[PDB]
Amino acid sequence: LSEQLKHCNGILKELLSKKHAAYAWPFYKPVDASALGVHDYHDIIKHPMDLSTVKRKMENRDYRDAQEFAADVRLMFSNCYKYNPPDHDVVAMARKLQDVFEFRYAKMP
Ligand SMILES: CCNC(=O)[C@H](C)[C@@H]1N=C(c2ccc(Cl)cc2)c2ccc(OC)cc2-n2c(C)nnc21
Ligand SMILES: C[C@H](O)COC[C@H](C)O
Ligand SMILES: [Cl-]
């Protein structure tokens, strides 16, 4: 990994850590639309994303730079904001996790 990608990996590890689990947990694995009963999810969300997918991509060296990584993390949040009403509990969780993400991403070397 490049130096900037190492910082990205550090952020990813933090997003997945116990420190943030109270609001990060919905983002750990791909949304299971059937399990959640949200039978319109894949009509609304054309490009699903979640932290396990970002992690696999990082491990496989799929991201060529920090910008590509950030676009995926942001896509994950955006999907949450697109599908759910803005007053929803899961949206509040997304906003909190995104605050953690954006502030640390801003500290990129
Ligand atoms: C109909 C209610 N809305 C949903 O079920 C969402 C599709 C779902 N809500 C939730 C959700 C709803 C309420 C609370 Cl307090 C936390 C998460 C959700 C739950 C589990 C999960 O993976 C295991 C992913 C979730 N998620 C993400 C991420 N983005 N949207 C959701
Ligand atoms: C809550 C907004 O959707 C994302 O805000 C990011 C800011 C760094 O908290
Ligand atoms: Cl972006």
Which residue in 49, 53, 33 sits closest to 41, CA to CA?
Answer: 33
The ligand that comes nearest to the alpha carbon of residue 75 is: 3
Count up the domains in the chain and report the number.
1
Residues with CB under 6 A from ligand 1: 26-27, 29, 31, 36, 38, 41, 80, 83-84, 89-90
Domain hosting 83: range is 1-109
SS (H, E, C) 2-49: CHHHHHHHHHHHHHCCHHHHHHHHHHCCCCCHHHHCCCCHHHHCCCCC
Residues 85 and 51 sit within 8 Å (Cβ to Cβ) = no
Instruction: Give the domain CATH number at 83.
Output: 1.20.920.10
